[PDB]
Design a protein around this ligand. Structure first.
Ligand SMILES: [Mg+2]
Ligand SMILES: [Mg+2]
Ligand SMILES: [Mg+2]
Ligand SMILES: [Mg+2]
Ligand SMILES: [Mg+2]
Ligand SMILES: [Mg+2]
Ligand SMILES: [Mg+2]
Ligand SMILES: [Mg+2]
Ligand SMILES: [Mg+2]
Ligand SMILES: [Mg+2]
Ligand SMILES: [Mg+2]
Ligand SMILES: [Mg+2]
Ligand SMILES: [Mg+2]
Ligand SMILES: [Mg+2]
Ligand SMILES: [Mg+2]
Ligand SMILES: [Mg+2]
Ligand SMILES: [Mg+2]
Ligand SMILES: [Mg+2]
Ligand SMILES: [Mg+2]
Ligand SMILES: [Mg+2]
Ligand SMILES: [Mg+2]
Ligand SMILES: [Mg+2]
Ligand SMILES: [Mg+2]
Ligand SMILES: [Mg+2]
Ligand SMILES: [Mg+2]
Ligand SMILES: [Mg+2]
Ligand SMILES: [Mg+2]
Ligand SMILES: [Mg+2]
Ligand SMILES: [Mg+2]
Ligand SMILES: [Mg+2]
Ligand SMILES: [Mg+2]
Ligand SMILES: [Mg+2]
Ligand SMILES: [Mg+2]
Ligand SMILES: [Mg+2]
Ligand SMILES: [Mg+2]
Ligand SMILES: [Mg+2]
Ligand SMILES: [Mg+2]
Ligand SMILES: [Mg+2]
Ligand SMILES: [Mg+2]
Ligand SMILES: [Mg+2]
Ligand SMILES: [Mg+2]
Ligand SMILES: [Mg+2]
Ligand SMILES: [Mg+2]
Ligand SMILES: [Mg+2]
Ligand SMILES: [Zn+2]
Lengths: 43, 95, 144, 129
RNA sequence: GUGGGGGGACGAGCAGGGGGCUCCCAAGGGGGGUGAAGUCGUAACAAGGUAGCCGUAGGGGAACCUGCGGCUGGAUCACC
RNA sequence: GUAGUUGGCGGGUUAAAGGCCCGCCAAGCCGAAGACGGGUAGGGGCGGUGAGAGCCGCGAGCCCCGAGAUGGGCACUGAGACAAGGGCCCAGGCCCUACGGGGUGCAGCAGGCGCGAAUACUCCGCAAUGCGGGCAACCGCGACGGGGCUACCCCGAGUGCCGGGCGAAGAGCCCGGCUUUUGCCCGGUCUAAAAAGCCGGGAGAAUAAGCGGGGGGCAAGUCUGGUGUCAGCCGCCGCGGUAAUACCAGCUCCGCGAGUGGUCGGGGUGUUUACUGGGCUUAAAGCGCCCGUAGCCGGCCCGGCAAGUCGCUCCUGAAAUCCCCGGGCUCAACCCGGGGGCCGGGGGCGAUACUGCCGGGCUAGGGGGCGGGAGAGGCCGCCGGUACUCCGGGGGUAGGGGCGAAAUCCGUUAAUCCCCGGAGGACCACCAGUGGCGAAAGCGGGCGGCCAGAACGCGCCCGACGGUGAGGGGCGAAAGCCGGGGGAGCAAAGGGGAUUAGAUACCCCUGUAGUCCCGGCCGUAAACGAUGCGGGCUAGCUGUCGGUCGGGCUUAGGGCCCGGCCGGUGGCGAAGGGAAACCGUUAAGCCCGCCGCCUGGGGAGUACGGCCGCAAGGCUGAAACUUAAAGGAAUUGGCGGGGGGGCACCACAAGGGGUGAAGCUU
């Protein structure tokens, strides 16, 4: 059948190279709606 | 899908048919759904020059009917596979 | 082939009985009325249950797909029944160990049956030793 | 076996109107049929109504004016109240200004407009539009 | 106020059978069904190479075969 | 099913009626309008969902009624209990003890263990609301009130505003200014006291955003890296096997936001439960056919009633909840006040069209008749027709029979073929038909007898007597079974001869049950029009059958032709219907009734139970589990050991030269 096995669990996740990610804080609802109005309705 | 409105046999308002036996066969079907082709038939065809009007030699002809099931009726060419439009054409079966 | 059937003005009870007779042709109504879920379900109608992991197993995906989906065998505490529970997430099986208490939960899929290409698996692991496997996989928590 | 002369007559009228005939003959008949035809003629859906005295109960010859879009007898004969007239109105008729229900009340067979005017109820009979 | 013997209604409990409805356990089977394609044939689909199918009975490694009656959902909507 | 069970009579007991209990007497009582039996469940106000009908119970919390206090019983006191923090006994636990005894069961408010996916403080007060006691003042109250904890439900807000720059118009950073909700500190008020709330005061941008997702459904990336049908995604469809928009990460964008997600259950979805409002020719689905009980549905007119129905009114349907309106909390959520409903019960007064009841009268549906015809309708008896097999005799030799070819086989004790006789079993050729009869199954020679059921014609009789029909029945091919008779032909099983790789098949020879008759059982079928039964309406044209009427002719006949009606039986085809094939006055159209059946596939006509059967078996008839389709009609193609036509020295025919064998080149 398939060439998979239980010994190969997590292979791709363990093998992918770790790239550090920037810190980020999401917006509050009012600021998000402000941003969407600014970027979509406006220019 | 239902081929033909006849059910394949013009049986009439009845429940069961007396049914017959096929010639060269025996698969056959009832009185309807069978072929009953008629031929003139006479022994020794075109000897009427050398017989009949020589000696006294009075011959006889006998009209003869042959009954065939669907398989033999197709087999001896008495029935073809006509198209859908021509399936409802009323033709005699070459006597 | 004509005129429903009991249409009379004083045919109300007969119409009600006739309509109630044909509700038993519905699989859902019959199952709900006869309690087949609470008789034959390993979860016994609960949205989740507890179990102890016995062995790690790998099921083969259905024909067009090629993969070994990794599950475990879990024995439920409340009934003792042993059922195969899919362990989701990449590398999720490595957070599972034998004799580990796990939270068994319905895999989803149509009508509570098996999921897309996994044949005959109805459950999946949500918690491992009291900690959610999602949090463990994401690193927000560590398995105790 | 014949059961409802009213539904029989109404469906005969509908069939004749579908075929675009000028007159429809109605046999057997009763006073309910006569009053229903009277209400229809009053509202213009049915033209002249001639009685024929055959020995077997009488006949009604009704002239059709091309005015019916759909006719039929509401069966069962549901008892309806004055406050309940409006939902049956919306149930059987198109538009709030088009068509009429026919009702049999203790003051006689009338339209749903006349029933709402009199503030009464009764038994629904048919619809016209 | 009582203490004995007896009778009475109510009536637990413990002894037991009787029955039922349930639920498990069992050496061994018994008909089945799902995989992935491993063997044997080729039964169905084309007049599928013996037209097909239905009920029934017998027979056979097996698909199935044969007898009887039926159907066309036939390969015939068609004698003279 | 019931046997104190149902009722009566006389008593006892009770506060009081009652088989509540007792003595006698009778056989009664319940049930297919579903007894009894099993299962589930406290009932209601009410709640969720849907536009609504409706479906569901989250019918937990709040209010009303019920029952219980570890299981099962029985009593004291008292107006009231057979009494949750009172009593006695059995059971089954547990705690203390000085062994003699005693106490105890949190389903009270906290709290602990256990179970489970799943849970709050061993807190404060009798100040509000009430209650028991008291003349009262007052007292008590784990009721109640207050806070605590907890992503309980609803409501209102914050996590900054303004301008400039960089950034991209974004995020973010920086610069200049503004504000202080909020968070923090203080005072008053508030609070039973606290906490919180509100008023006021202080510093300060300062203290405060996540969850899910971006291949389609479905808003958001063919951007970058990694992996390479592995790892993983995936409610469904589907990705991943080197260039992944779907997996792992980065960047970036999207949805909602103090929430956002996963799994469950309900509703929507769903016209997949269909009253509104589905379907049953072929997709799932008309019982094989008919008789009929309950039920449901039922012709016309007149008179009476006023039961259903309709109108108004009254007594009601607790409160909360729900809808509308006004008002009060900063608006809000919420609270207060008024109207409505809360789908119902009953009383009074009215109406009579419709339904029902009662009475009288009809003939339109139904039944019963009379007349001349039609019919393979049935049962019974007698008879025939050829064919056939066999037997006996006569003729005449040597083959016959069979097949693609044979062979087995029959024959020299004379076959096949011919003739003369006899016996036996089946069938009823042509005529003969989408012809007839019958409910279906089914029925095909003639004559006779006994029955049955229709159509037609009628100024005949009765007067709605009708439809359908769960349950209940009766009839019901073939095969098969039981017992008896018969047995010509055919022929499962079986034997043999062939064919084949095999041939336990297809071909040939043979052959037994069986096929036929009598009595019974079986009770099934592609028992089919795959089309339930009854009635009405809706263009026509055409073949044929029966009756009848008008005209014409006459094989002068019971005959033929044309036209009309009624009733069958086929074809084409209006309107209309349908997914389409197609149906289309013989509807699958437009309607009025009643019955049966269907609710994706497989599992599976399976298992269990019951009933029926001599048996085979039959009827009835699941679930677990598994699956994303199975399926209908039609279109294009492809193919066929189906049909038809056309063509070709990369086909054949008529020819010529060759290659295939030897040596050598390749
Ligand atoms: Mg038949
Ligand atoms: Mg699936
Ligand atoms: Mg084959
Ligand atoms: Mg074949
Ligand atoms: Mg055989
Ligand atoms: Mg044989
Ligand atoms: Mg008394
Ligand atoms: Mg009693
Ligand atoms: Mg809706
Ligand atoms: Mg509570
Ligand atoms: Mg007790
Ligand atoms: Mg007590
Ligand atoms: Mg307790
Ligand atoms: Mg407690
Ligand atoms: Mg107080
Ligand atoms: Mg909020
Ligand atoms: Mg810029
Ligand atoms: Mg304070
Ligand atoms: Mg995220
Ligand atoms: Mg991504
Ligand atoms: Mg999009
Ligand atoms: Mg996705
Ligand atoms: Mg449907
Ligand atoms: Mg079908
Ligand atoms: Mg039928
Ligand atoms: Mg059946
Ligand atoms: Mg059948
Ligand atoms: Mg009344
Ligand atoms: Mg109010
Ligand atoms: Mg109420
Ligand atoms: Mg109320
Ligand atoms: Mg009947
Ligand atoms: Mg029946
Ligand atoms: Mg037989
Ligand atoms: Mg024999
Ligand atoms: Mg033979
Ligand atoms: Mg059928
Ligand atoms: Mg259809
Ligand atoms: Mg047609
Ligand atoms: Mg069945
Ligand atoms: Mg059984
Ligand atoms: Mg083609
Ligand atoms: Mg040549
Ligand atoms: Mg050579
Ligand atoms: Zn033949």
């Amino acid at each position: 059948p398939s060439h998979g096995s239980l010994t190969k669990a997590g292979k791709v996740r363990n093998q992918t190279p770790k790239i550090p990610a920037k810190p980020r804080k999401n917006l509050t609802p009012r600021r998000r709606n402000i941003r969407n109005y600014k970027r979509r309705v406006l220019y | 899908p239902k081929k033909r409105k006849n059910r394949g046999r013009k049986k009439g308002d009845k429940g069961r048919e007396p049914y017959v036996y096929c010639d060269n066969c025996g698969k056959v079907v009832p009185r309807s759904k069978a072929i009953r082709l008629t031929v003139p038939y006479s022994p020794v065809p075109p000897d009427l020059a050398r017989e009949l009007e020589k000696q006294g030699a009075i011959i006889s002809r006998y009209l003869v009917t042959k009954t065939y099931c669907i398989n033999c009726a197709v087999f001896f060419g008495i029935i073809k596979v006509r198209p859908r439009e021509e399936r409802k054409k009323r033709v005699p079966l070459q006597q | 082939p004509g005129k429903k059937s009991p249409y009379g003005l004083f045919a109300g009870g007969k119409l009600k009985k006739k309509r109630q007779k044909f509700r038993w042709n519905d699989v859902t109504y019959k199952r709900r009325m006869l309690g087949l879920a609470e008789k034959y379900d390993p979860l016994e109608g609960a949205p989740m249950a507890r179990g102890i992991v016995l062995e790690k197993v790998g099921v083969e995906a259905r024909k067009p797909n090629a993969a070994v989906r990794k599950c475990v065998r879990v024995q439920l505490v409340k009934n003792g029944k042993v059922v195969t529970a899919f362990v989701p997430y990449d590398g999720g099986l490595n957070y599972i160990n034998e004799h580990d208490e796990v939270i068994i939960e319905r895999i989803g899929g149509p009508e509570g049956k098996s999921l897309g290409d996994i044949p005959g698996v109805r459950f999946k692991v949500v918690k491992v030793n009291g900690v959610s496997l999602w949090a463990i996989w994401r690193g927000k928590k560590q398995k105790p | 076996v014949m059961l409802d002369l009213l539904s029989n007559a109404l469906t005969a009228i509908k069939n004749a109107e579908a075929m675009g005939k000028r007159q429809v003959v109605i046999w057997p008949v009763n006073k309910l049929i006569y009053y229903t035809l009277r209400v229809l003629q009053r509202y213009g859906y049915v033209g002249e109504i001639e009685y024929i005295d055959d020995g077997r109960g009488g006949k009604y010859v009704v002239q059709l004016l091309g005015k019916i879009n759909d006719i039929g007898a509401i069966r069962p004969r549901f008892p309806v109240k004055y406050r309940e007239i409006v939902e049956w109105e919306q149930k059987y008729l198109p538009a709030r200004q088009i068509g009429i229900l026919v009702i049999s009340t203790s003051q006689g067979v009338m339209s749903h407009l006349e029933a709402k005017e009199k503030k009464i109820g009764g038994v629904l009979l048919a619809y016209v539009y």
